[PDB]
Each structure stands twice: as structure tokens, then as C-alpha cells.
Design a protein around this ligand. Sequence first.
Ligand SMILES: OC[C@H]1O[C@@H](O[C@H]2[C@H](O)[C@@H](O)[C@H](O[C@H]3[C@H](O)[C@@H](O)[C@H](O)O[C@@H]3CO)O[C@@H]2CO)[C@H](O)[C@@H](O)[C@@H]1O
Ligand SMILES: OC[C@H]1O[C@@H](O[C@H]2[C@H](O)[C@@H](O)[C@H](O[C@H]3[C@H](O)[C@@H](O)[C@H](O)O[C@@H]3CO)O[C@@H]2CO)[C@H](O)[C@@H](O)[C@@H]1O
Ligand SMILES: OC[C@H]1O[C@@H](O[C@H]2[C@H](O)[C@@H](O)[C@H](O[C@H]3[C@H](O)[C@@H](O)[C@H](O)O[C@@H]3CO)O[C@@H]2CO)[C@H](O)[C@@H](O)[C@@H]1O
Ligand SMILES: OC[C@H]1O[C@@H](O[C@H]2[C@H](O)[C@@H](O)[C@H](O[C@H]3[C@H](O)[C@@H](O)[C@H](O)O[C@@H]3CO)O[C@@H]2CO)[C@H](O)[C@@H](O)[C@@H]1O
Ligand SMILES: OC[C@H]1O[C@@H](O[C@H]2[C@H](O)[C@@H](O)[C@H](O[C@H]3[C@H](O)[C@@H](O)[C@H](O)O[C@@H]3CO)O[C@@H]2CO)[C@H](O)[C@@H](O)[C@@H]1O
Ligand SMILES: OC[C@H]1O[C@@H](O[C@H]2[C@H](O)[C@@H](O)[C@H](O[C@H]3[C@H](O)[C@@H](O)[C@H](O)O[C@@H]3CO)O[C@@H]2CO)[C@H](O)[C@@H](O)[C@@H]1O
Lengths: 107, 107, 107, 107, 345, 345, 345, 345
Amino acid sequence: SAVEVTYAITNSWGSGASVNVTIKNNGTTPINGWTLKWTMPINQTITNMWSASFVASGTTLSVTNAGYNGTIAANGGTQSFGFNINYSGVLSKPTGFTVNGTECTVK
Amino acid sequence: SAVEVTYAITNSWGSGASVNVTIKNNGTTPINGWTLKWTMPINQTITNMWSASFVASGTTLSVTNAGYNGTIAANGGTQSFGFNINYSGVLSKPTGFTVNGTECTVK
Amino acid sequence: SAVEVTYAITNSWGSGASVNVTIKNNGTTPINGWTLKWTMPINQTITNMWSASFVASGTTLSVTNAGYNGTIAANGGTQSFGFNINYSGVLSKPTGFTVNGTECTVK
Amino acid sequence: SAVEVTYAITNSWGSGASVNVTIKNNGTTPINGWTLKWTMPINQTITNMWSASFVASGTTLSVTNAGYNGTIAANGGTQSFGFNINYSGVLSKPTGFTVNGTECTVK
Amino acid sequence: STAFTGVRDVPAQQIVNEMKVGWNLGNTMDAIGGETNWGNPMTTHAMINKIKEAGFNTLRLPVTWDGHMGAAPEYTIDQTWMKRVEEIANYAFDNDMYVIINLHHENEWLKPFYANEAQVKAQLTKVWTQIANNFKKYGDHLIFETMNEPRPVGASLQWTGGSYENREVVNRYNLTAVNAIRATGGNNATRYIMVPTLAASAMSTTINDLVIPNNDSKVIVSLHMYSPYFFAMDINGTSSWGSDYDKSSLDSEFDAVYNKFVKNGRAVVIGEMGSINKNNTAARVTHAEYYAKSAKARGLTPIWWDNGYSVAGKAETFGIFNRSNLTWDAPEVMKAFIKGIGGSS
Amino acid sequence: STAFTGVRDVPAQQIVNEMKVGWNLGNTMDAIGGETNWGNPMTTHAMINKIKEAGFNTLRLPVTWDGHMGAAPEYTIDQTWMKRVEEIANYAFDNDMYVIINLHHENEWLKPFYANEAQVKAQLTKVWTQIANNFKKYGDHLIFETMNEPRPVGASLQWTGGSYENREVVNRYNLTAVNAIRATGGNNATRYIMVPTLAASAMSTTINDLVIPNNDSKVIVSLHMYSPYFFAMDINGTSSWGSDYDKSSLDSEFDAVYNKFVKNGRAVVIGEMGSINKNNTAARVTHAEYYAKSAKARGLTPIWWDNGYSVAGKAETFGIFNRSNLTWDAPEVMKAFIKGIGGSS
Amino acid sequence: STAFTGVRDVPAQQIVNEMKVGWNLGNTMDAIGGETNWGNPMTTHAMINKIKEAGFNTLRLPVTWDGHMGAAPEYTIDQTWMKRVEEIANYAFDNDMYVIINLHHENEWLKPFYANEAQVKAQLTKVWTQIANNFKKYGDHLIFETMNEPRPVGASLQWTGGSYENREVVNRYNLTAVNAIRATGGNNATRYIMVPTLAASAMSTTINDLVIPNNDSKVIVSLHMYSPYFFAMDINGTSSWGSDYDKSSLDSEFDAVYNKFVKNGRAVVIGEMGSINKNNTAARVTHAEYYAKSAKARGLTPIWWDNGYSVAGKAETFGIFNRSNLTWDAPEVMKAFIKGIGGSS
Amino acid sequence: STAFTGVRDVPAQQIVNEMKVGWNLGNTMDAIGGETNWGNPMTTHAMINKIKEAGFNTLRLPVTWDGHMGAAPEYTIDQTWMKRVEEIANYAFDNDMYVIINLHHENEWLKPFYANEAQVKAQLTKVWTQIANNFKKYGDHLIFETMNEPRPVGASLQWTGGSYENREVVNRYNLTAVNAIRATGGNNATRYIMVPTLAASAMSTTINDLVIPNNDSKVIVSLHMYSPYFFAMDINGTSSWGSDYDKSSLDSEFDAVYNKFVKNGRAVVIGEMGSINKNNTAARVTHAEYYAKSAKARGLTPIWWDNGYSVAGKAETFGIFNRSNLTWDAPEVMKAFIKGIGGSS
Ligand SMILES: OC[C@H]1O[C@@H](O[C@H]2[C@H](O)[C@@H](O)[C@H](O[C@H]3[C@H](O)[C@@H](O)[C@H](O)O[C@@H]3CO)O[C@@H]2CO)[C@H](O)[C@@H](O)[C@@H]1O
Ligand SMILES: OC[C@H]1O[C@@H](O[C@H]2[C@H](O)[C@@H](O)[C@H](O[C@H]3[C@H](O)[C@@H](O)[C@H](O)O[C@@H]3CO)O[C@@H]2CO)[C@H](O)[C@@H](O)[C@@H]1O
Ligand SMILES: OC[C@H]1O[C@@H](O[C@H]2[C@H](O)[C@@H](O)[C@H](O[C@H]3[C@H](O)[C@@H](O)[C@H](O)O[C@@H]3CO)O[C@@H]2CO)[C@H](O)[C@@H](O)[C@@H]1O
Ligand SMILES: OC[C@H]1O[C@@H](O[C@H]2[C@H](O)[C@@H](O)[C@H](O[C@H]3[C@H](O)[C@@H](O)[C@H](O)O[C@@H]3CO)O[C@@H]2CO)[C@H](O)[C@@H](O)[C@@H]1O
Ligand SMILES: OC[C@H]1O[C@@H](O[C@H]2[C@H](O)[C@@H](O)[C@H](O[C@H]3[C@H](O)[C@@H](O)[C@H](O)O[C@@H]3CO)O[C@@H]2CO)[C@H](O)[C@@H](O)[C@@H]1O
Ligand SMILES: OC[C@H]1O[C@@H](O[C@H]2[C@H](O)[C@@H](O)[C@H](O[C@H]3[C@H](O)[C@@H](O)[C@H](O)O[C@@H]3CO)O[C@@H]2CO)[C@H](O)[C@@H](O)[C@@H]1O
């Protein structure tokens, strides 16, 4: 894929953690109004989010840009957002991501 | 500060790790040609870096944009880069950062 | 009217003349894809036109921009075209002009 | 020459006339801040000018843009201005013009 | 209360984000002849409480001033009317909401033609001067919308972009309105302001011809997008919605607005939208949820038009809230709309 | 003859202005199974002479190459086929006309998905290399159009803007095609080239996602705009056209294209448009003339889709020229279209 | 009088064009400790009459407010001082001129660092509220300039663009100043306002980082360009000016400004410039006339810095008008500067 | 070897990032009268090996073609000369470096005036066709630079931006050169090409008037910036460098380039820069290291001008590599320059 998702842990405190996500567009076409979807790992709950908003439905987590960061420029542009979660025990990370229907590489 | 730096761990493997760094500009003025400076924790070495270049002098690290990502737009714009390190001991993170001379909030 | 038309004679040769037309937009809104209409005097015929094209229909003459000059900028912007006429009798100027439906002033 | 100047009489009343000048740039480089120079027949005096200002030195006439119309775009861009003159005798028009030092075609 | 929180200098997109999703008190203060003249009950604090509890964070408060003001030159607005608008706004501020106050059904005087321009400007100035003066102390949670859907009247012109004349004069009116607001000073010099295109249409003709008064970064664009027309608005149009074509078509309408305004830093509020009741709940649910998430993905904040009329099978039945019962006449639709908007926690 | 007149360096908008207005040789070289397989006679020089005489200055020559080429890796195009395309192009060159040659119904191999991209690019490269090499000798009156209506297959997707994936891959294919043409050098290094959006659609989604290969200033956008849909294309749609709403809606379609491309110096050709025959000549006359002058006012050059089928009351009856006897089947529609285009004398 | 002409809604470029060319009342109301404290006599109506008569249409009235105001929280400005400023302004309004009033040598308190920001903003707000309130009735011939040359303190930093911190904070202060002005309402909400880059420098670092408060189209950029440095400003620099190099270097300085601002519709005033007296009148004549015509060719209006000190061979001798005599100390310099500006009649 | 690695479709900024930092083989193939006629030895692979080892990734190979070509119409280039240029380039490709080949001291025929345009374009076309053809198989590690410092002849015009005529004609020549290169096809149709402003000057006048041939995205701007002049270049100028003012002034020169080109996605190579030997190693080390890091912070790749002449106290002493010895005449300057550049590991 030409879209890469970087899912990284900023901080954790055993019962919760803070995540930063960076989406990188290496393709030729700008993504005008990005959305990002993944399957929420079991035992994880998003408590709050910034630079984006979300809808949690079942094990599905759908994230939407915040407008001012809606366009992911082509040829290596990025946009990022972050959130806190509560979790129990092993801090798992989503295994796949979709950006506007496009399956991503996880970096 | 009106500039926030997010320093996050993408992945680690005991003797090495992958880091993602996101700089966020919440001020009114764009940062035209960003440079980011900080002190690495001891017992950490940068092996390679992408989306930016660096000069290391002891634990002093100076990172420069890669041109195409040189401007961090005002009012919430971001740019990001990443790198791998080898390390020993606890995986510590830097405690502060300077962007073009301006002290950053560590988020 | 905030739109002015200047209809001026560049050169004449007894049986014909060369005309330059400048449309000036003194309004607040750009004119996106200008068209200019007037009533053609009797005894006159346009022989060729540049920077614009036209349709002659009865005594009505409808002129259309050439694309690259299609926008008349607000607050003093101009666009110009010209053409040659053959005429007989007295060389009269058109009396009225309308640009995209708006009645113009004649300078 | 790739720069064309059109000097046209809009209206004349025996003792005075109104002139419209259009400058056309058919070259590849925008003219950033245009100036137009010519030698004015001796029987003529400019009384007032709009969309431009001028310096008259004997018969040498130097016209400068009004800022908002300072750039003549490449590949057929135009800008225009006008003025009134008082004159005695036969109404003549200048036959040579220079724009930013480039000799023009008179059309 | 969010009534008096002062005025920030953040980008309008941030304000639009916080506005989040809104609800119109339709056919109320906008009703010709007064608040209850079009069949709605007198508005209560309890009603607005319910709107906030449902998940809405903005109350759009459309006001028709024609009928409540005297003659030239002063066009004095009735004081009881003015203070009643303020009372209702505070119902919302008590709930920590945003409130939008506009000029609504002003077509008997607000006419976008060169020939009416001078006199209309004079009236617009007096009208906005009085409104702005009354609300001067309120902070940035109060947003003024300069006009509603200024347009040439005349049936054949209803869904058109009007003439260049009309669009030009609308731009001049927006400038006059903004300057009148700002000239009263205080928080009015810095508050966020919404301005419409001709007819508040999002069609290319009208969005391409919009000129932002003073290029002011505090200005937000106001669009009304009851899309798609036949499903959402036409009592005789289809009662089905949800095909790939439907979704793609709705996306494309928003993409036009994203590309023209949002991605260039110009924030946009869809101040009116919604669907009528064709006794088609499942379709209205699918449409409302998709509209919300699709619009949000383009940085847009949508505001439902609720005129208090919800009877299945009748035209103009955009109402989803039951004001007399303090319950939802269309609970599924409302919930779906809110669900589509998502959130930050 | 505009055969070998060299390749000028003028703004692409000037080329488009000169192209002026065009006619498609539809259902001919694009027809599956060969030139006469969809009911048209063998094309002749006399036919094209008539096209020119009526006032058209552009012949669009759609070609389907699938079915006329060998296997990978060379995808060799049948010599006889290539030679026939060239022979027809020259009928137009003799008339001093512009000619557009494309790839047309290539849907069986040209698929806009990541999964197919590698195969498709290899073939696209070989196909354009051969076409470019064969036609290298011709000057700027020969224009290459890289693809026709690249889109994901499926009837349910026909009027959508595809997925992001589809639009990304279409942009990739356009780059591949342009590079393949440019790489042959000579006149092909400076020739003007048309590229389409996904499905050649003018909708916001697709025009906003178009990426010009290398930002090449010699690139022209290719859109197909059979507008309005119900009147122009739908056998069950209205037979009437010409209300204020009709005119305004069409204007706005073109305004979207003007604002995105033309006013920014990016030239645009409407490579296909037209109306079918619903025994509604007067309406079609009103529509054709208004379409022409409205499009031309936004700097656009329209090209009529003529498939040689003109029977009143049937779908797909876009044909206006009678190829069998060299008269116009729809003289009035043709004359109105041309009249709306106007001229420089 | 031009004092009370109301406020137009024209582009700022038109205001700059009408401003035309200006003269600074330097080392006067800006002088530390009072009007006469730096050797200038008390300003008279007769003095300003001569300025207008020579052909200047703009009086820049620099004012240093530090030393005439109380302590926090009110920072009350001496009313006598305020009225004196207003009085001098009216000398110029009586001559139908434009007047610019700024804050000048405020560096003891106006410090562009994050650490000082809160307190500086508080003082800036109070100071501009008072000045603006005083002049509220004055029309668009009165222009406010928010600050003079805000910059980090230190001799080694005088000709630098400061740090990102400094430039960011200057932008914040400009917004603060503009908001304070606009919040007073009336003509203050619509008047034209000049804002400087850091140090009012035209260098790329500082013009590239300028942010226009609210993107307000009524804002004009304020730059100081004593170019070229060595000839114009340095007592130890060349006494000669006139080579092709000299002409080209100067053009290029103005070209940076034209390209960043003017050509994009952002108007610019060169609020201070001029040359010192190195007993080189002929060179100064050449320089002054070329400067005027080169600046004007880029839509720039220049304003001569006249500190009333004209003594040959000394540093800082920018004075060209003799205030005691009502004659010109440098008549040839003056006349050449005016001649280069031209006019509309 | 990087000689034959084909051509990527990546953004030009990535190419410039990979070039990283460069060294000029100065006063060699650019020398009037032959490779060794200006004091340098015959170039060897060993020398180039040392260039790579030191940390340079780009060799700029300036070539004067005047003196090695016949007269019209063919302006045939001596094949022995052509192959010697190619041989040297391969010393660099063997070290996996980038190579830039230009036209250098062509001033005797390359005249930027309307009167000369027709003849100069003919020669340019012939010259670049030959060079391009010879190197057609090389991949994207070979970059052509269309011209060196095209400018009107004359000592007095040396540091000017020429006339509009000159700048217009330079832009015409760049397009002529680029078209000639591209017309040869293959890798030449897609390789990266550098084009200079008039005089390769970074001054506002010249960078503002640069027109990119065909808007081609594979075009890189070529600038020469021996800044600051007095320190870097003037034998009678300061020997010191390093104050806050020096750093700010350098930053600002790069800021003009960053803002005009780099931040808009147009990539830029500083093809020549450096400092002469004023027996001031410490200063030159401070300057070289800051130049590198400041330039790089603005996306610029700088290339040192080494004419092989390093004698202290003498003009034009830019040499830092000792070719005869395979050591560095200025090891500390070289090391600081490279250290300033940094790396990805
Ligand atoms: O039945 C009560 C009164 O209703 C009036 O019609 C209104 C509709 O009920 C109401 O839904 C509609 O809302 C408009 C909105 O004001 C406008 O901004 C937007 O563009 O479109 C909406 C949907 O049409 O307003 C109309 C009134 O204009 C009847 O007109 C009135 O007679 C009746 O008593
Ligand atoms: O669906 C295919 C057809 O799309 C047409 O473009 C549409 C735009 O994509 C769509 O954004 C636009 O939407 C308008 C809407 O029509 C108007 O009422 C509303 O007020 O604003 C919306 C956003 O601008 O409508 C156009 C036209 O339908 C193509 O023009 C057409 O060729 C294509 O087949
Ligand atoms: O009757 C002959 C054959 O016709 C085939 O369908 C075609 C129509 O006759 C033709 O007018 C239409 O043209 C397309 C054009 O190719 C496309 O680029 C544009 O988007 O739309 C036009 C209108 O649809 O093409 C169709 C073929 O794809 C029948 O398929 C065939 O069976 C029949 O023998
Ligand atoms: O006349 C004696 C007083 O002079 C004071 O210095 C000033 C110069 O005389 C004055 O010409 C200069 O003007 C400044 C201008 O204010 C500033 O905005 C611009 O950037 O540069 C100009 C030239 O420097 O200002 C200085 C004062 O700051 C002496 O300070 C004072 O002691 C002496 O009595
Ligand atoms: O230092 C203050 C003076 O700066 C002037 O602007 C300078 C630009 O900031 C600087 O970028 C520019 O640099 C040029 C250099 O002059 C030229 O030789 C080289 O080839 O390119 C460089 C980058 O463009 O020079 C200008 C002019 O000196 C202000 O114009 C001046 O008012 C100010 O005092
Ligand atoms: O070695 C003796 C020869 O030197 C010749 O002059 C050159 C200098 O030695 C050389 O360093 C200089 O390089 C140029 C560079 O080519 C140009 O692109 C850049 O802009 O400026 C540099 C100089 O600052 O070139 C000159 C040659 O033009 C003498 O001309 C020659 O007589 C002498 O034998």
C-alpha cells in the first residue's frame, strides 16, 4: 500500500495509556478528508481523543479528521491525532487499518 | 508553550526500539524550516532516521526537516518523523525539546 | 453601475475600423466567465475578432471571453478584446452594453 | 516584440479627448510592476489619468501602474488605463512605446 | 453558562468543531406573525434541556424581524421581541451550547437588486446595529448569521443561482451586515459571524461567487443543504435512500464545499438540513447517520431543521422533537444523526 | 493539411479555443469487433469533409485497441488496424482539423485497483509506446487522450466517483500513459495530451482528486458531460428543456469546471456530450445552442457524441449525422449547436 | 478638512495610492521626554502647510507614549498629551492629508518574548483603547500604526530578524493591538490599520513570518527601508549613488515586497526612508528620485524620515525641511523625491 | 555503480535530499583551452574516490563547450571531448554519486537579448541534443543543468538582475534547452533537470521572474550563492564571520529561496558557493558549518566551488581539495561543511 499508519505509545500507567497515530500518504493523490478505521483490541476503551473524533461501534473504531487537518498531502504528507485508552494487562495494538477504504501498511 | 512535541514508542525489542516524533504548532506563525533539538537519555544510540536528518554530539541531538516537510503550519499544524535506536536499561524518553529555539511542551 | 465598458477606436480606414474594448469591474465580486452584449449599429459588420468570439443575432451582438481572459477581477480588474469592422455611412458606437446581465456604464 | 500596446481614442470633443491604453504581454514572463514610456506629440497635454499615474517631462511621458494592476500576466495577459488630454491642431497618437525597457508592437 | 465566556482568537474551524452538531428552533421566532403563530408552543427552558441531553451542542435560533420593527430611518425593533430572543438564547447558554441568531424571513425588505441596494443597506445597518447592541456582552458562544437565504423571489428562480447582479448585491449586503455588527464594538468586534451565499446554496455558481467581508478569518460560511432533494424535501420524491450511488452523490456535494472552503481554512456550517417524514423511518435513519459522518469527514457541522411538524405523509414534516411532550417524535432518526456525528470521548 | 505542421508552444487554452467544437466518430473504431460491427458504414473522406463543412473543427476518433493486440510482453497492435486509424485521422488533417485519438473500451484489461496496477501499467506502456511511435510525425493538431472512462466495473458503481483507491490508480495510469508518450521523443515530447478524471466524470469528487502527470502544462483535462442527465440521456426522462432552472443548473455544472481548472490556466475539453432523440427537436435545439454558448463562456470546447443511431424514441440515439447519404439526420440540432459556439468572424 | 470624511470600503491598495507620498514629523512627539526635547521647535499649522504645498499628501505622526502614561492596570495617558497629538493631526487634516499615528519608542515596555507577553498585551490593550477612543470620530484619512519597530533588545540584534519566538510574539501583539482598536467600535472598527514586521524590517525572514491580524483586508503592512544602507544611513558609507548596480539592488529590495505582499493584494507603506547629508546633494537627488519612482512602480508609498537635523557631514542628518524658517534645507532632494512620485494630473 | 539505475518518478525534493551535499570539479572541463589549461592536473578516478570518502554525494561537473564545437548549423561537439566528460562522470557513478553536467562559460555565444534569440536558441538546441543523446542511457543520478549564469555581458552588470528583456530571454532559453533534452526521449524524457535564474542569482528580481519550462515537476532550480559576498568572495573584505548579524543575514538569504521555491514543492540546489582563503581557517570553519546546516534546514543542497586553487591571501582561492596529493588543502573547512550537513545514520 501507499498509505502507512504508525501507531505509537506516548505514555502508559498500567491501567491506561496515551496513543499517538500518524497517517502517512506516499501515493500521488491527496486524501481530502481522511477517515481511519480499525478493530479495537479486546479490553481496550478510548477515554478521550484530540485532533480527531471517533465512533466506536462493536469492535469497530472509526476515526474522523478534525477539519483543519483533513487533507493528507501526497508524496509523503502526514496528519496525526492522539487519544487515551483504558486497558487491562497486555497493551495490544490494532493489526490492520483502513484509510478511506484503502488498506494500510503498519509501520 | 504553543509548540507541543509528542515522543512515542512505535515498537521495542529490549535492546532497540522504534520511535515516532510529532511536532504540533499551536501558535499563529508558521514554522518555516523546522529544526528540533533535545538531549537523548544515556545508553541510547540512533541507528537510522527517516523524514528528517540529524547531527549527534554526545547525547545532544539536532534534527532537521527533510525539505518537503519543512513547514509546520500554524493553528494546529503538525510534521512527524521517526527513527530507530539501540538502548540498554529502561526505555526512557527526553524530558524537553526545543524547536527553532522555542521550548516545547512535552505531550 | 459598478461595471464600465470602454469602446474605443484604435484606427480607421474610411471603409472600416479597428476597435478595442475594455471591460472594467469596479464591484466586489469577480466576474467568472464574462460575456458582453450590445445592439449593433446598422451599416457595421465585424470582420474578425481576437481575444474573444462573438455571435451576431439580428441587431444583437454577443461577445464571449476566450477562456484565459474569462475572469474580470473585482475592485478595478479589467479584461480587453478587439476586432475589425467594415462600415458605411457614419461610424457609430453601440449605445448600450450588458455584461452577464448587468447594465454597464459607458466611459 | 512580445509586448503589444493599444492606444485608442474613446471620445474627442475638438479641444480635448479621452484615451484608453491596453498593454498586452504575449511573452513567457509576467511583467511584475509595469511602467510604460513614450514621447507625446507637442500639441497635447494630459489633464487627468486613472488606473495609473504619470510623470511628464517635456514630451517624455512615463506611466506607472496603480499597484492593484501592477502585474501583466504572461501568455496574453493585459492591463489597461486611461486619461484625458487637451489638444490643439490635429489629434495625433504616439507611435512607439517601451514597457519596462522593452520596445512594444503598436496594434 | 456559556453566555459570557469572552471571545477567543482561535481559527473558525475550531469553533465549528466545538459547535459539533446543531438543532433549529424552526417555525418559531422565524414565524411570520410571532412565536406561536405557526403552531409551535411557546418555547421553554425544558425543551432546550432535552435538545442538549440528546447530544446537540448548537441551537440555531432563526428570527424573523420583519413585522417587529418600525419605519425608516430608525427601523426600531420592538423591545419585547428583542428580549424574548435573548431569553430563548439563554435557555441554550444555560446548557453550555452555542447559539446562532440570524435574520430569517426578511424577503419583504431584503431585496438583492441594484435598485433596492441603498435603502436595504440603510435598513440592514439599523437592524444589525440594534441586534448587536442588545447582545454585546455575550461571548464567542453567540454567533450571528447575517442573513438567511437572500435571493430573487419568483417561482422560476427558486433553485437557481440568481443573476450576477443578485450575487454581487448579496456580497455587498454581507459586508454591510458584518460592518454594522463590528461597529457596535466590544465582543461584537471579535465574535464569529456566519454569512450565506445567495440562497445559502452550495451550488458551484453561488459558492464560487461568495466574497468574504474584509477577508475576515472570523467569518464562517453558511450553507443550507437538504440533500438529496427528492428524498429529503419532495413529498412526491423517492422514500428510499442508501445505494452506493446515493452515498457517492452526497459525498460529492460535500467534497465541493470541502475543496472550495474547508481545506483552505475557511470554516463552514450547514445551518439547515434534514428529511421530511414519508413514513420511511429506516431510510431516514440510514440517510441521517450517513449525512452526519460524511459531512463531519469534510469538517462540516450540520444543523437539523426542526419546524415542529412531524406527521407522516405530509410535506414539510421536518420535525423530530415533540415540544409539547418533551419526547422525540422521531427517536431513531435523531439518534442515528447524533451517532453519525461521533465524539471525542 | 494539419498533418505535419510542427508542434507550437502556446497555452493549452489556446489549443482548446482552436479546437473550437467537435464531433465524435462514435461506435466505429471504438466498436467491439471492428469498424462496421455496430452498424456504421466504413468511414470515408467524404463524411469527414461534411463534418468540417458544418462548422466542426475537431474530430474525436475513439479507438478500442483491445481485440487488436497480441499477448504480453509486447502487446503488439495489428499493423492493419493501426494503419486504418491513421488513414481516418488523415481525412481530418486534410480538412485542417484537430484530431483526438484515445484508448476507448479497454475495460477488460484496464482496471483501476492496486491489485491490477502492475499488469495494467506494463500493457498501458506498450500500447501508448506503439501508438505514439506510429503517430509521432503529426503536429499539434493531433492530440492524444490517455484513456476514456477508467472506472471500477459494476452497474451500481456507474455514476459514482469510485473509491479513493480507484481514483489514486487512475492518476497512476495517467502518469504511466503520459510518460510512455513523452518517452518516444520528437513531436511526442511537446504534443498536447488529454487526461480523464475517473469515469471522465465532472463531479466534485473526481475533479478534486485529479492529479496532472508531472504538472505538465501541455496537459488538457478530459470530461464527459451529458447534462442534464434526465433530458439528455434517459429515455424515460423529461423531453423538455429550457426553463430558468434548466439554464441555471447547466451553468453551475460548467462553473464547477471553470473554477477548478480553467480559471487556473488548466484547459478543459468536454470530449463527449449530447442528447438522445425523444421526438423533441425544438427542446433539443434550445438545449444544444444553450449548452454550446454556456460551455464556451467557461472556456470549454464541447464535442458531440455521434454514434450513428438517430431513431426517434429509442435509448442511445445520439446520432445527428447521416453517414450513408452525407446529410444531417438532425440538421436543426446540429445547426443550433454550431450557432451557439459562435466564431471570430 | 479630511478629518471627518467617514470610512470607505475600498481595497487598502487604493488608500495607499491616495496616501501617495509622505513626510515624517520625526524626533518630535516621538522624542523621549517631550515634543521639543530633541531639538525640534513646537510644531505649527504653518509648518504642515509647507509640507502639503511641497506635494506630500501624508503626514506620519510618530508618537512615543511611554513617559506620558500612568502605571498598571489603567496606564492612563496624559490627556494634555493626547490632545496635543490630536491637534497636530488636525494641522494635516486641514490640508486634506492622510495622517498616520503610531506607538513609537515603546521598547522599555514592549518586549517580544513569551515571558513578557501577558503584561505587554495588557498594556497594549489599555494604550490602544485610549488612543482609539479619542480619535473615534475621525474618518479613513486617519490611519493607526500598531507599533513601530518591535524587536528583541540588544545592539547585536538590531539588524537581525530576531528569533522565531520574537516574530511569533510580534504577530500576537499586532493582533492584540488591532483587536483593541476595533473593539472601540465606530469608525475604529472599519478604519485602515498599518502593522509592522519585526523591526519593521523588509528582510525575507521577517516578511515571510508576518501574520495579518484576522487576515483583515483593511490592514496595511508597515516597512522601514533606508536602502541602500551604506549610502543612505552610514556616515562612514559611500557618498555616491547611481550605478546600474545601485539601481538594480534597490529594485530588488522593492521586488521582494511586491512579490510577497502587493501583487497578492496586500498593500504596503514604507513608513520611513531617506538619506543622510554627506555633502552629496547631487547623489541624494539621484537616489531620492529613483527611490520614489522605483517604489511607486511596485505600488509602494514611501514616507521620508525627517528628524529636523540636516547638518552636512554628521550622522543621522535626515532633515530636509527647515521648521524655524518654513523653507527647505534640502530643496533639491525634496523636489526630486516629489518629482519621482508623479501624479494623476 | 549508479550510472544505469533507471529513472524514478519521485518528487524532485527527494532527489535533492539524496544529492545531499556536493563538490565542484572547478576550473577543469570548464577551463578555456582544455582540462589542464587552468592549472589543474588531469582528473583521475582516485581523486573522485577521495571526494566520495569525505562525505560528498554529488559531483558537479562544469563543462565549457565553446571551444570544442563547430559552427552552424550543427555546432558539432568534438567526440573526444564528449567522451572525456563521460569518463569523468563515471569516476563519480562508480562511487554511487550524483553527477551534474552543465554548459558553463558560454558567454561568447549565449546572449540573453531579443536580437540574438533566434540564433542562440538554434545553437542551444544543437548543443543539448548532442549532450543528451550521448548520455541517454544514464539513469536519474545524472542531472543536466541547462546553463550556468546566463546574463547580459558587462562588468557593470555583473551583480544586477539584468533587464526584463534579459530575464524573459533567459526563460526562453531554459525552455529551449529543456525541450531539446526531452525531445531525445528515453531517460532524457524523465530525468531531473536544473535550470538557473538570470546569473543564477538568488536576488528577488531574478527568482521572482523565473519561469519553470512547461511547469515541469522534474525541474530543479539552480542558484549560486557565495554569501555573504564580502567574507566569502571579496579579497578586500572582512576575514571574520560568526556574529548574530552574520547568521541572521545568511538565514535570510536562504529564507527567500525557501519561501519562493522549496515550501511550494519546487526543489533547489545551490550549485556553487564557498569562501576564499584569507588565512582565516577558524572563521571559514564557522561559516562553512553554519552555511551547511542553515541551507539544509531550508531543504537546500549546497555544492562547494573548488577550482583547485587554495593559496592563502589570494583572490579566487576556493580550492579545498589537493588533487595532486589526494589530500585536503583545507581539511578543517571541508570537515565542518560536511559536519553541518548531518545524515540519516
Ligand atoms: O404550517 C405553518 C406555516 O408554515 C409555513 O411554511 C414553512 C415551513 O413549515 C418550514 O418548514 C419552512 O422552513 C424553511 C426555512 O425557513 C428556509 O430557511 C429553508 O430554506 O427551507 C425550509 C423548508 O421549506 O418555511 C416555510 C415558510 O417559509 C407556511 O408558509 C405558512 O403558511 C404556515 O402557516
Ligand atoms: O453525479 C455525476 C454528475 O455530477 C455533476 O456534478 C455535481 C457535483 O458533484 C455536486 O457536488 C453538485 O452539487 C451541488 C448541488 O447540485 C446544488 O444544488 C447544491 O446547492 O450544492 C451542491 C455542491 O456544489 O452538483 C453537480 C451537478 O449535479 C457533474 O456536473 C455531471 O457532469 C456528472 O455526471
Ligand atoms: O447498437 C450498437 C451497439 O451499441 C452498444 O452500446 C453503445 C452505444 O450505442 C454508444 O452510443 C455508447 O457510447 C458511450 C461512449 O462509448 C462512452 O464513452 C460514453 O460514456 O457514454 C456513451 C453513451 O453510453 O456506448 C455503448 C457501448 O458501450 C451496445 O453495447 C451493443 O450491444 C450494440 O450492438
Ligand atoms: O537629535 C538628538 C537625539 O537623537 C536621538 O536619536 C534618534 C535620531 O535623531 C532619529 O533620527 C532616529 O530616527 C529613527 C526612527 O525613530 C526609527 O523608527 C528608525 O528605525 O530609524 C531612525 C534612524 O535611527 O531615532 C533616533 C532615536 O531612537 C538620540 O537618541 C537622542 O539622544 C538625541 O538627543
Ligand atoms: O538586512 C536588512 C535588509 O534586508 C533587505 O532584504 C534582503 C533580503 O532579506 C535577503 O534575503 C536578500 O538576499 C539576497 C542577496 O542580496 C542576493 O545577492 C543573493 O544573490 O540572493 C539573496 C536572497 O534573495 O537581500 C535583500 C536586500 O539586501 C531589505 O530589503 C532591507 O530593507 C533590510 O534593511
Ligand atoms: O586559474 C587561472 C584562470 O582563472 C580564471 O578565472 C576563473 C577563476 O579561477 C574561477 O574560480 C572562477 O569560477 C567562477 C565560476 O565559474 C562561476 O560560475 C561563479 O559564478 O564565479 C566563480 C568566480 O567567482 O571563474 C573564473 C573564470 O571565469 C581566469 O579567467 C583565467 O584568466 C586564469 O588563467
